[PDB]
């Protein structure tokens, strides 16, 4: 009798865990935990957990845009996250989340691909940002985006040069350079029950027994990068402006967190 | 082109191969030394049992999705999925793999089947899932130990625990057996070896090795040395499990 058991708390303006329908859970990060990788970031929202490792490589660009350094995300929801996943190729949720991360990377414009061209037409960086879920207690997109941003700030790259005599490029793994990022997109999730009840940061069950879900990415300068609204019982702008406000608040909070962290290093 | 992942570049080579330097060599150390170990069981929530082990740059998870319906024919099974995160190691490899992941999976299975007792888990398959977050040396051994912790945590029955240990060979003129080495001592090495045993009843469960060279006596000394190392390591894991059980008793 789960749904009924849950409406009882909902009408008491609470949840069975101790959250006041509009607040998230303990959010934490860890930067630079990993050496084998260029950038590393661990994020965890109480029980939910995510880890991003971003590697850097060389590659030849296309012909439509030689001055574009690729940024390739891939999400991995291995069976150790939850039992709803099985050993094998990626399912549907992993692929959707991957496309979401990519759409974000491309629309928020946190990074200029042009800032990754060494020798146009010949070389350009490729940033393989590999995200991995480890506990799918719910709201994995927020964690994925936040960990991506964190690691993508941690990443500092080397400097390369070209020699015309050898016609080849050399790297200098001693000197390096951080990676400039302009926008700081944060994602805020929502679960819409029957008609009008929007809960924030929904965990697993709350998403299992929900009529719809929503996610909203809110850049710092009062703008939006994505409004992911896959199905649902419906919404009017009045039940949406409130979500946007709360998203701005969450932006502020997590940006303060990330600043404190990058400054505590 | 894979149609279940994002469209990336065809090929991509790392920058190191384009570097110009003689990388630093470790040098000297106490051959019978062990790295500091942080082992904790009970990390993950959504899993019946999980474990995490860190030894130097080595960082490994293991989870156990418990019995899932699927005598000597009504005997349990356990299928193990080893998997190194694409952000471990100097080079990047697509997630799938297909060369060494499966070899190390076979190794884990051959080293776990003995310890675990599957007569009490008939008509069932235990999904063991290892994950290597960072490679910094002895990896397969860490994975064995972590899977053992995760199993003992989920509460699957056993006969004894599994302790692993990795060894290498110094290519110097006087080659000595290097215990619990680093990725540098392992890429600059001649021979490598991996033991895994059950220390109470003193029985190997699965070993492995390889060599630019060697000889009977050397391999034997390596074996016994790894056995002693595993013995010296067992108590850490013991204390970890006790601690996790105490935390569970506290939660309720």
């Amino acid at each position: 009798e789960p749904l009924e058991y849950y409406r009882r708390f909902l009408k008491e303006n609470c949840r069975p865990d101790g959250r006041e329908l509009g607040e998230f859970r303990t959010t934490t990060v860890n930067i630079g935990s990993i050496s084998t990788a260029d950038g590393s970031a661990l994020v965890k929202l109480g029980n939910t957990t995510v880890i991003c490792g971003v590697k850097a490589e060389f590659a030849a660009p296309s012909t439509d845009a030689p001055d574009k350094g690729y940024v390739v995300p891939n999400v991995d929801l291995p069976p150790l996250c939850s039992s709803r996943f099985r050993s094998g190729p990626p399912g549907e949720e992993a692929q959707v989340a991957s496309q979401f991360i990519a759409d974000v990377i491309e629309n928020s414009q946190i990074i200029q691909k042009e800032d990754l061209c060494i020798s146009p037409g010949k070389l350009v960086w490729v940033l393989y940002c590999d995200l991995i879920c480890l506990d799918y207690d719910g709201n994995i997109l927020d964690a994925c985006t936040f960990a991506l941003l964190a690691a993508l700030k941690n990443v500092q790259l080397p400097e390369v040069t070209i020699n015309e005599e050898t016609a080849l490029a050399e790297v200098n793994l001693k000197k390096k350079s951080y990676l400039n990022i302009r926008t700081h997109p944060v994602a805020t999730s929502f679960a819409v029950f029957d008609d009008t009840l929007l809960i924030v940061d929904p965990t697993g069950e709350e998403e299992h027994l929900a009529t719809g879900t929503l996610t909203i990415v809110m850049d710092e300068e009062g703008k939006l990068c994505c409004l992911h609204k896959p199905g649902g019982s419906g919404l009017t702008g009045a039940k949406l402006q409130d979500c946007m406000s709360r998203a701005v608040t969450r932006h502020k909070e997590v940006k303060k967190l990330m600043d404190e962290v990058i400054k505590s290093m | 082109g894979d149609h279940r992942r994002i469209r990336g570049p065809e090929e991509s080579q790392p920058p190191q191969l384009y570097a110009a330097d003689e990388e630093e060599a470790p040098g000297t150390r106490d051959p019978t030394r062990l790295r500091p170990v942080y082992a904790r069981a009970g990390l993950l929530s959504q899993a019946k049992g999980s474990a995490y082990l860190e030894a130097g740059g080595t960082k490994v998870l293991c989870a156990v999705s418990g019995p899932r319906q699927a005598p000597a024919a009504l005997r349990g099974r356990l299928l193990c999925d080893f998997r190194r995160a694409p952000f471990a190691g100097r080079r990047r490899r697509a997630p799938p793999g297909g060369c060494e992941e499966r070899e190390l999976a076979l190794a884990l299975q051959e080293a776990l089947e003995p310890a675990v007792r599957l007569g009490r888990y008939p008509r069932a398959q235990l999904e063991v899932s290892a994950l290597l977050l960072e490679d910094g040396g002895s990896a397969l051994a860490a994975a064995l130990t972590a899977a053992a912790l995760a199993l003992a945590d989920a509460g699957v029955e056993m006969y004894d625990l599994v302790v692993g240990c990795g060894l290498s060979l110094a290519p110097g003129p006087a080659p000595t057996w290097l215990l619990d080495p680093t990725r540098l001592e392992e890429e600059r090495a001649a021979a490598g070896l991996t033991v895994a045993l059950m220390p109470v009843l003193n029985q190997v469960a699965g070993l492995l090795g390889s060599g630019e060279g060697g000889l009977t006596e050397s391999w034997a000394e390596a074996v016994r040395l790894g056995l002693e190392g595993c013995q010296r390591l067992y108590p850490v894991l013991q204390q970890s499990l006790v601690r996790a059980a105490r935390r569970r008793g506290a939660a309720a």
Partner: peptide, 11 residues
């Protein structure tokens, strides 16, 4: 062998 602290999963 002595122990250490979690560079990644501290508690």
């Amino acid at each position: 062998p002595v122990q250490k602290q979690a560079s990644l999963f501290p508690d």
